[PDB]
Each structure stands twice: as C-alpha cells, then as structure tokens.
Amino acid sequence: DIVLTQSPASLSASVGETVTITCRASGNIHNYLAWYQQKQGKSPQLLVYYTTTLADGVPSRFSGSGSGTQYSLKINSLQPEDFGSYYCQHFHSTPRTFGGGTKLEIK
Amino acid sequence: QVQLQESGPGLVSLSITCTVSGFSLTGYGVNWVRQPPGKGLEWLGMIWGDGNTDYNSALKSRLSISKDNSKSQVFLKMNSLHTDDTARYYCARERDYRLDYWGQGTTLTVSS
Amino acid sequence: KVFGRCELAAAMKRHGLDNYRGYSLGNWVCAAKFESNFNTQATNRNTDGSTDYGILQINSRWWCNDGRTPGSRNLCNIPCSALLSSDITASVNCAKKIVSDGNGMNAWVAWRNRCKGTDVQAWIRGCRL
C-alpha cells in the first residue's frame, strides 16, 4: 500500500506568519492528493484537492503544490481560524491512506 | 443540502449506519474513516456509486461495507472487534477523488 | 481512428481536460469510451433530427452545425464536419465550451449513466502522461 509521511508533527506559529507542511508518498500518486483541516471537536473539512485546487470557500492564502511523490501545503500569513490539524490523503487507486497529521498551534 | 449522519452502537459483530441526503448514492462514493481519541485519521474503506467496495488492507477481513440506494443509507459492518477499534467513525461523501462532505461522526467504544 | 485509452488520456491532458472545471482526467476518457468507443469518426442519429459526431459525440442541434438539423443552435460555433478528425483539438475545444461548471459533464448521457459513480481513474492508471 502507498503510505504517506507527513511532517512536521507540530508547528508553533503566530498570526501573520507563513508555514509549510509536507507530505511525501511511498509511491507515485499522480497528483491525487487532497488536504483537510480539522478543528478541535469538529470533522475534517476539505481544503485542497488534486494537489492544487482550493475547495469552494477556502481563502487564497492557502496553496498546494507537488507532483509524483512529493507534496506541500502552504499557508501565507496565517489567521486565527487557521489553527488546528491538517491531514493529507491520497486517492491513487485503493487503498487510500492519510498522512499522520500536523498540529498548527498558536505560538 | 448535502448531508451525512452516522448512527451506531456506542459501546460493544457491529454495524454503523450512514444516512445521507441531498444526493444519490448511485452517483457518489461514500468512504468510512476513523479517528481514535487524540489521534489521526485512518481510512477504513469505501463503496463506489456503482456498488464496488474497497478496503483498508490490514482490516479487510473484518470489514464489510454495503448500502441501500433506495433508503439512502450506507453500512459499515465490522467483526472480531478489538479495543484498538475504539474511535470516532465518520462516513464521508467522495466526489471525484476528494471527500467533500463529512458526517459529524459517531463514537465507538469496545466494551473494554 | 480508434484511440487506445492511454493515448487518448495523454492527448486530452495536453489539451487541458485534466481537472477542467474540477473533473478529473478519467471522466473524459470514460465519456469517450461510452460515447464513441474511442472512435473519432463515430456517428449516431437520434429519434430527433439530431446527430452526434466525433470522439465526444457533439450534438448537431445545440452545439455544432451540420446544416440538416431543425432548431440548430451551434453554440460551439463550428461545423460538425470539422469534428471528425484524428486530431481531437476541435472536439476538446467544443467540450470546454459545453462544460462551464461542475454539473457540466451531464452533457454526455453515457457519462452520466455509465461513468458517474464508477472509478473513472481506472481508465488512466498505468498510462504514461
């Protein structure tokens, strides 16, 4: 099965800073990578699909990139509503898997 | 008005139901995902609009997903339950390779 | 001409259909499979004066003009005759005018009845693109 390695496990940041999260796949996932944001006590919400496309309603300060086996999510000048956890998930064939998650916390 | 809501046993063979509305199960997949308390997301499996099913490889022998298109319900059945199965279980709609709408989840605790 | 699925997937990707309006590449290859069986010269006349042409079966009453269909609208502003070549350019150009949002692929009955709800990505895995 293709496994996703997400890093870092945690990030301490302040409003206005820019942070990047990485997700590399053990095998080529051909751009089929999505990102989710999850707030404390809530369900995950789609942020980015097919590597670079922002889901409806997601602010442009979020950007996704990558190809082959390596992907990244970048948040430019992060805001209060951005703190929480982030997970990547691939959709190249089955089974699908998720990265281990990253917690973005207030510095 | 796309909506999904999980219904389950709470404490516990087990079956969890995902009741959906706002779309037809014949045209969308529904994935099952779980998350142990304070942990990350784990993919369990899915049922495609056309009825085909795919599962987490390590858990394949204990999982069974099925649905009733006419009742807009999807079912996750698990057997040989284990304490490692304690977690919040979510069903989520898949639209063309992204999970775009998710239920609030249902908490499951294995009588342990 | 009859395309192999991978060869078609590569051409559709070069012509910008991969994730066009949010529809992944396999949807388009799947549509061509069930609409024309990958044949660039496919034709099909319907009960109504309409006739569909090409790899993506573009309709002669709403999208292309064949000059023999009652109520012709020609929204793609192009002759149907021009949509039967081995080069898929014109057909893709028209397909992009047809799909303006995320409900757009319903423009193809076969995609709606036989591709939607299936693993359309299976039509492209293993293809080099």
Q: Break chain B into its structural domains and give their ranges.
A: 1-112
Question: What are the distances in angstroms from CA C114 to CA C35, C117, C122?
Answer: 10, 8, 14
Give the one of B27, B52, B97 whose C-beta lies nearest to C116's C-beta: B27
| Closest C-alpha to A2, from A24, A25, A23, A35 | A25
Q: How far apart are CA C52 and CA C61, in angstroms?
A: 9
Q: Is C101 annotated as a binding residue?
A: yes
Method: X-ray
Q: Rounded CA gap, A19 and A66, in Å?
A: 16
Query: In terms of DSSP bridges, do strands B106-108 and B87-94 run parallel, antiparallel, or are they unpaired?
Result: antiparallel
Backbone φ and ψ for C97, nearest 5 degrees, come out as -75, -30
Which of B23, B52, B96, B100 would best serve as a mutation to test chain C binding (most C beta carbons within 10 A)? Answer: B96
CATH label of the domain that carries residue C82: 1.10.530.10
CATH topology of domain B1-112: Immunoglobulin-like (2.60.40)
Domain enclosing residue A75, as ranges: 1-107
Closest-CA residue to A64 (of A73, A75, A76, A54): A73
- Using the 8-state DSSP alphabet, how is residue A101 labeled? -
**Rounded CA Rg of chain A:** 13
- Coil, strand or helix: which one is C129? coil
Residue from A2, A28, A30, A56 to probe the interface with C (highest C Cβ count within 10 Å): A30
Measured CA angle at C121 (ends C115, C127), to 5 deg: 125
Q: What is the distance between the alpha carbons of residues B5 and B63, in angstroms, rounded to a whole number?
A: 20
What CATH number does residue A24 fall under? 2.60.40.10
Closest CA to B80 of B107, B55, B62, B59: B62
In 3D, which of A101, A3, A46, A43 has the Cα closest to residue B33? A43
In angstroms, the CA A26 to CA B88 distance is 27
Resolution reading in Å: 1.8
What H or E segment, with its residue span, contains residue C6? helix C5-14
CB A97 within 8 A of CB B49: no
Task: Kindly report the backbone phi and psi dihedral angles of residue C112, in degrees, each rounded to the nearest multiple of 5, phi listed first.
Answer: -65, -40
Please give the Cα distance from C25 to A34 (Å, whole number): 16
Residues A13, A41: Cα–Cα separation, whole Å? 21
Which chain C residues have any C-beta within 8 angstroms of a chain A C-beta?
19, 22, 24, 121, 125
Sorted by sequence, the CB contacts under 8 Å of residue C41 that are 6+ apart come out as C1, C54, C84
Starting at the edge strand found earlier in the chain, the sheet holding C51-53 runs C43-45, C51-53, C58-59
Instruction: Tell me which DSSP letter residue A59 carries.
Output: -
At A88, list the tokens: 């990547």
**Cβ count within 10 A of residue A21:** 22
Q: Is B108 left (phi over 0), alpha (psi -120 to 50) or beta?
A: beta
CA–CA min distance B38, chain C (Å): 33
Closest alpha carbon within chain A to B32: A96
Where does B2-107 have alpha helices with state H?
Answer: none
Structure-block tokens of residue C92: 């893709």
Place of tokens 């057909």: C91
- Beta strand A102-106 with A10-13 is parallel
Strand partners, C65: C79
Return the sign of the alpha-carbon dihedral for residues C1, C6, C10, C15: positive
Instruction: Evaluate whether A38 touches B104 at the Cβ level (below 8 Å).
Output: no
For C71-84, b/e burial (b = at least 16 CB within 10 A) is: ebebebebbbebbb
- CB contacts of C23 in chain B (<8 Å) are 96
Task: At A16, give phi and psi (nearest 5°).
Answer: 95, -15
The answer to whether B98 and A49 are in contact (CB under 8 A) is: yes
Provide the number of structural domains found in chain A: 1
For residue C32, what are the domain limits?
1-129
C48 is catalytic: no
Largest Cα–Cα distance in chain C?
44
How many domains, in total, are found in chain C?
Answer: 1
CA distance C28 to B7: 36
